[PDB]
Design a protein around this ligand. Structure first.
Ligand SMILES: OC[C@H](O)C(O)[C@@H](O)CO
Ligand SMILES: OC[C@H](O)C(O)[C@@H](O)CO
Ligand SMILES: OC[C@H](O)C(O)[C@@H](O)CO
Ligand SMILES: [Mn+2]
Ligand SMILES: [Mn+2]
Ligand SMILES: [Mn+2]
Lengths: 495, 495, 496
């Protein structure tokens, strides 16, 4: 589910005070920085050099163009010299693309024996970026700030992680969610304000009768179903009974029809996320299962039981992660063994095979929920390692993003009677404390779990979106966490 | 140095009539003893003055009114020797406009175990008297400093002595007059601000004069007094060999002395203690004021370049705090990003105060294109080393913010033969990368006041007196926590 | 004289695909006709442009992005011809930074009783289309003007036409550059303020220049062109006898002419449309600018005395709103408390704009101690009579406030033979006693922009666009109610 071309504009500020020769050297430096940066494979997207800006209208022009350019996912600004910040007011007012303020310098060291006034006039980011820093503070602008020399690999790393965040934000602002049916009845956390979320994030969330999907599934080519099956047998282990013609293989075939119909519906409307609900499956043979797991592996967002917030979150985290190690997730049951406390996570069917440590198996088991026929699904153990588990909730007047850092662990025991894929994790700082903190913050039971997305990225995304992000990790004291929820509540009110 | 009027601190002791006249006599004896002993200690830069024990609403209100009327009263230190019902203090606390310090102390250090009786319990009961007083101060939201401990404790006296300087600085701030020769450097943002608001908040009087007003004073300087001033330059500094004899270079220095004497006459006539100039308005001037300003700063005049009246007032203020020691107008010019040796070179195009010099300053003449006037004479030197603060005061539009970075000034390892300006090298805490990110996030200015003498506590206590936010970047700072505190502070300080 | 770049107004029509392509065709036809006919009605001071009917989020966002980037687009007029599901408008409304007017109209005037059917109901359904759109605007809190009624109603067209003038003033304000020769008059409070906040809020660029910069331009004025300007003074005004032939009085008038040309040269070079002076800084000048200033204002330049950049910008933008008619810098000078005939005399020490003159201006030269310079030449005249507004824009520290008093200028019944400045008399509504008290409670400045042409509706619409409070004092004003509104308003505008 690939992306349109994206690029990041590098805008360098200066002034006319020091003359045209100085301005020539500023351009020279910026053009070199961009070219060298584009040689480093750490960057997942290209920088594009933009002509040095020195006047209010040049600044405003480049910001206007950045706004209109569909490929521009972010603007990186840097003051090479002093660049009087009132000139930047008009541009900053126009800019709606994500902004990163790079506070850097062309040379690494001070040339002690040669440094003169010309050098002082030229390489003065030391103060140019501070005057620019003030107008940003003064206008209350959303920004990432990165400090360091431009060849420092740590700097390039902040830059590169940020590019994925910005590109995720670009995808978020054009994100379309299709809902097949409404929320599970009586459920609170998956409910919320779609107009509010379209205003805040850009998400478009709209509802379709399950019957619209049923028609697409009905029109699937049997030839294509059979080819998809061949692919299933190539990628996965199939339960022995499904490896021969008969009713088990047919159950699998039916998920293949569902996958192909879903995919056709979604491509037709340019949707990149979707929801289903087991309470509305008229005309469907099975709850979508294996089909959904597959579409998630292709980069589609998904939320169960009408959960559009989590479907959008899964999709944008997929973009942040470059499609790696990311899944819709739900906390299912606990292991309270002293010293070995952990969480088993799953869903009734829909867990993405990209978090699998073992080769997935296609299985068919009964599912009473929904009252439909035994669904086919992929079954596997999730892998191990550091990860995040994130929830995005609607508090009524505003949204809150909640991020728990966790450590997935390998199971020490088989779970032979368990018909769904699953993963085990130990949340930080302990199961006891993270669960209390989560509950205090009203975190959902549905989350996006990811081995790839970092907390920095989710925080930066929250900065771009203008919403609160709270983090639960190894350093969390619960009492402090309670205090921060209160202090944050007063800041984010009316904002 | 620009000497101060006599200042003094009033010691007001609270009690009540409940225990009789003999108990009140003993209270007075203790207070008189504390004042007299305190004034024998050279740690205190200003004298304490015993005030008569107060026990009634009218006595309390009277002493507060008198403190407002007294030009020499720089602050009031209040101590409850006994219970002193705080409703009696309401009237006086509403009237009082001098800075207040609540000293929570006790006459005796130790409990006389084998003789302590009800009379002693009645008399030496600060333990609750100061708490009842503590309440009324919290209840009325009064600005105050609180100091706890025995009055012969050196740590207690230290806190008191430091606060005396802060309070004197506040007294100077309330009567501060700034003269601007010319407007802000065009298009610059951080040096702009609300002079009316600043006069309301701090008392600063900031008004503008045409550069021509200064030129007329420079024209009226007597040539005899100029010659004498060159003799002092000769005595005090290393003059460039070229200027040590008659000819162009010496005439370049003689011009700064003319500027110095014209400036001094202007300022003294208007009772100004700080001033600004701008390189964009130098009509009638031969040179940008340079040496002249450097000398004036060393005498204790506040200064801000490019029309910067906030930094000018900050510099005068901090000079008072520092008793004229080790304090300068400053600006971050260029960085040294050598791993394990990151530092900042600070300077200005001419105006850096010699009170921070480690080496004997040299008088030098070099071209300065900025301003388009004749080659100006200036002092050149390396800044000294050691712990320092770098502070800027910005206007956020609806309020002011004091930002303070604790730094470590370092001795240069190499010569800078081509650098025509005085300069200083420092390592900001907790690191270059972190302090600069925090500084930019706080929107701190490029222009600061740098000081080896002023402490963070003093700046904070100043902010408390002036009713503004003060934010500190030091070795303990984490940028993510710093970021939160800005948000939470902004909600408190709003309105 | 100082002329405007071309401006136009985009007409954006909303619909949806629901009813079919033929219906969309009928929608486009209606909108093209509306634009065509509006453009054939001389009440509009600027033309409308037809924009392709928008029906999808992408079409909406595109036109809003284009409006933003178009220098000549001064405003967007939106109308929902049919239901046009408002979530589609979110992306565009977030993007749009040009002034917005929501026109709630309908193509046909009357219900066609004998033939109205479902097709018609589907097509001509602004009645609910504009309500859903109204919702999203309230929901997102956008700045907007709403106008209701049939598109051929002359009252509807009049609201539209007036708003065009306001909106064009706003575009001018957004790009306004002020030059200040010298700083504020020392110790003065109301003319002080926050230039950064003002540039953020209004867009005004405000920067300071040494008087020496102006003096240099004055010295480079061609004596030829001075003489041609002097010729033009003779043509336009009654010059005082002693200034008619060569001599000291005519030399004085000649000096103002030099100031005039240097000032204009400087201003044009930086595209400045407003400026300030200060009598406290006149080094290298022979006179305080007087006659020169009066003439620059007459050309449409904004001016504020004593460093007053807020009034200078206000003067300029109200000139634009007024199309240069009957507008001036102004200051309340002295009162006439005669019972039943209470009035205010307004003037300045020199600088009153001749466009408010009811008599032919006289060029005169009198001494002026203020500033310590040579006797300045200036235009002297009586101001006109009639309905006017007197408006002040102040800085409360944390935000700006616009204060406008509706007044009636009156003709003097007596001469003022000893009075060496131009002046005007007015009777403030609802009374001198009450208007002055309300003004003081609102902290209104002593410097104002006075105008015979600018309406209260336009100042209010400008304030809406700029996101600032506008308070009005007029014939319906009760001081006690007005006092409450200051309180309630300040709670609304705080932190906003
Ligand atoms: O551009 C102006 C100067 O050259 C310096 O950058 C410094 O003075 C900034 O205030
Ligand atoms: O004994 C009465 C005194 O006033 C004491 O200080 C105490 O009881 C006040 O609470
Ligand atoms: O567009 C849908 C319908 O036709 C109508 O507009 C109305 O029912 C909307 O509420
Ligand atoms: Mn669920
Ligand atoms: Mn500077
Ligand atoms: Mn005036």
């Amino acid at each position: 589910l690939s992306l349109r071309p994206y690029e990041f504009w590098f805008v360098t500020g200066s002034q006319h005070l020091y003359g045209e020769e100085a301005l020539k050297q500023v351009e020279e430096h910026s053009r070199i920085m961009v070219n060298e940066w584009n040689r480093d494979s750490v960057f997942p997207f290209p920088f594009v050099f933009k002509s040095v800006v020195t006047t209010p209208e040049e600044i405003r022009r480049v910001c206007l163009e950045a706004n209109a350019s569909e490929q521009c996912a972010g603007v990186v600004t840097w003051m090479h010299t002093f660049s009087p910040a009132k000139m930047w007011i008009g541009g900053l007012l126009e800019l709606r693309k994500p902004l990163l303020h790079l506070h850097t310098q062309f040379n690494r060291d001070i040339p002690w024996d040669s440094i003169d006034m010309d050098f002082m006039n030229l390489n003065q980011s030391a103060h140019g970026d501070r005057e620019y820093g003030f107008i940003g503070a003064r206008m209350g602008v959303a920004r990432k700030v990165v400090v360091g020399h431009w060849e420092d690999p740590e700097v390039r790393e902040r830059l590169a992680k940020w590019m994925r965040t910005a590109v995720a934000f670009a995808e978020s602002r054009n994100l379309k969610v299709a809902r097949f049916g409404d929320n599970m009845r009586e459920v609170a956390v998956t409910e919320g304000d779609k107009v509010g979320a379209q205003i805040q994030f850009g998400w478009s969330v709209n509802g379709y009768g399950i019957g619209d999907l049923v028609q697409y599934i009905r029109d699937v080519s049997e030839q294509k179903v059979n080819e998809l099956l061949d692919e299933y047998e190539e990628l996965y282990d199939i339960v022995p009974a499904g490896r021969q013609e008969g009713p088990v293989r047919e159950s699998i075939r039916e998920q293949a029809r569902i996958e192909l119909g879903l995919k056709a519906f979604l491509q037709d409307g340019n949707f990149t996320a979707f929801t289903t609900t087991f309470e509305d499956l008229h005309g469907m043979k099975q709850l979508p299962g294996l089909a959904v797991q597959r579409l998630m592996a292709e980069g589609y967002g998904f939320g169960g039981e009408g959960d559009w917030k989590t479907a959008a979150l899964v999709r944008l985290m997929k973009v942040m992660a470059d499609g790696k190690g990311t899944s819709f997730m739900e906390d299912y049951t606990y292991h309270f063994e002293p010293g070995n406390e952990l969480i088993l996570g799953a869903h009734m069917l829909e867990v993405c095979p990209t978090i699998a440590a073992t080769r997935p198996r296609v299985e068919v088991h009964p599912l009473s929920i929904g009252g439909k026929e035994d669904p086919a699904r992929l079954v596997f153990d999730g892998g191990e390692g550091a990860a995040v588990n994130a929830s995005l909730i609607d508090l009524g007047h505003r949204f809150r993003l909640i991020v728990n850092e966790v450590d997935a662990v390998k199971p020490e025991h088989d779970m032979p009677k368990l018909p769904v894929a699953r993963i085990l994790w130990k949340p930080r700082p302990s199961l006891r404390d993270s669960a209390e903190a989560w509950i205090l913050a009203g975190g959902a039971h549905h989350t996006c779990f990811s081995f790839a997305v970092t907390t920095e990225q989710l925080q930066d995304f929250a900065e771009m979106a203008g919403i609160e992000c709270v983090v639960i990790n190894e350093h969390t004291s619960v009492s402090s966490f309670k205090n921060e929820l209160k202090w944050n509540e007063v800041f984010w009110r009316g904002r």
